[PDB]
Amino acid sequence: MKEILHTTVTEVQRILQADRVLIYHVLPDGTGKTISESVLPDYPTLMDLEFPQEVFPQEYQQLYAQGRVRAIADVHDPTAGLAECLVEFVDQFHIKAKLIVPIVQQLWGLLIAHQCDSVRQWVDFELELMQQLADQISIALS
Numbered sequence: 629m630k631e632i633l634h635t636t637v638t639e640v641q642r643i644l645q646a647d648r649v650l651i652y653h654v655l656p657d658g659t660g661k662t663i664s665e666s667v668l669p670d671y672p673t674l675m676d677l678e679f680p681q682e683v684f685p686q687e688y689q690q691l692y693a694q695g696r697v698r699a700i701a702d703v704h705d706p707t708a709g710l711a712e713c714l715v716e717f718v719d720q721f722h723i724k725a726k727l728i729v730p731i732v733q734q735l736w737g738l739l740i741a742h743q744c745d746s747v748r749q750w751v752d753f754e755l756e757l758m759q760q761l762a763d764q765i766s767i768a769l770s
């Protein structure tokens with residue numbers, strides 16, 4: 629399953645030509661953590677870093693359990709909807725755009741793409757494609 633999640637993020641990174649693709653998993657204590665990552669070598673491996681424990685709030689569990697994709701073209705646009713607690717994070721890791729799709733069975737996790745070199749207008753077919761990839765991960769888990 630660890631090799632399957634690695635294969636998936638690597639293939640999704642190549643398909644989107646994203647700077648990073650990762651899978652973020654919600655743990656039974658209500659914390660969240662990156663568990664698989666493919667990143668272009670000009671950027672850090674987030675999995676190699678020693679992050680403090682991170683609460684994944686009930687607000688976002690209840691949102692993402694509903695299944696909908698969130699495309700954020702420009703994380704610095706004050707109307708684009710980046711969570712306020714992530715403002716310092718996107719600055720420190722030079723994340724400019726992100727694409728988030730929930731992995732649901734009950735939220736298991738999120739498939740997330742980053743653009744780092746530019747803002748990125750994600751287009752409708754890419755949001756549908758990530759929904760299909762999230763469905764493929766859920767089917768694999770079953």
Ligand SMILES: *[C@@H](C)[C@H]1/C(=C/c2[nH]c(/C=C3N=C(/C=C4/NC(=O)C(CC)=C4C)C(C)=C\3CCC(=O)O)c(CCC(=O)O)c2C)NC(=O)[C@@H]1C
Pocket residue numbers: 650652660662674679680681682683684685688710711712713714716717723726728738740
């Ligand atoms: C604010 C709402 C709370 C919160 C929620 C949250 N976090 C993510 C996703 C990621 N968080 C990552 C890692 C860390 N590690 C830290 O120490 C830290 C604080 C500086 C963070 C943010 C991480 C690698 C991810 C996945 C990749 C990504 O870019 O998202 C999410 C889901 C994404 C989204 O934008 O909705 C949420 C809701 N984090 C907090 O610390 C608050 C308690």
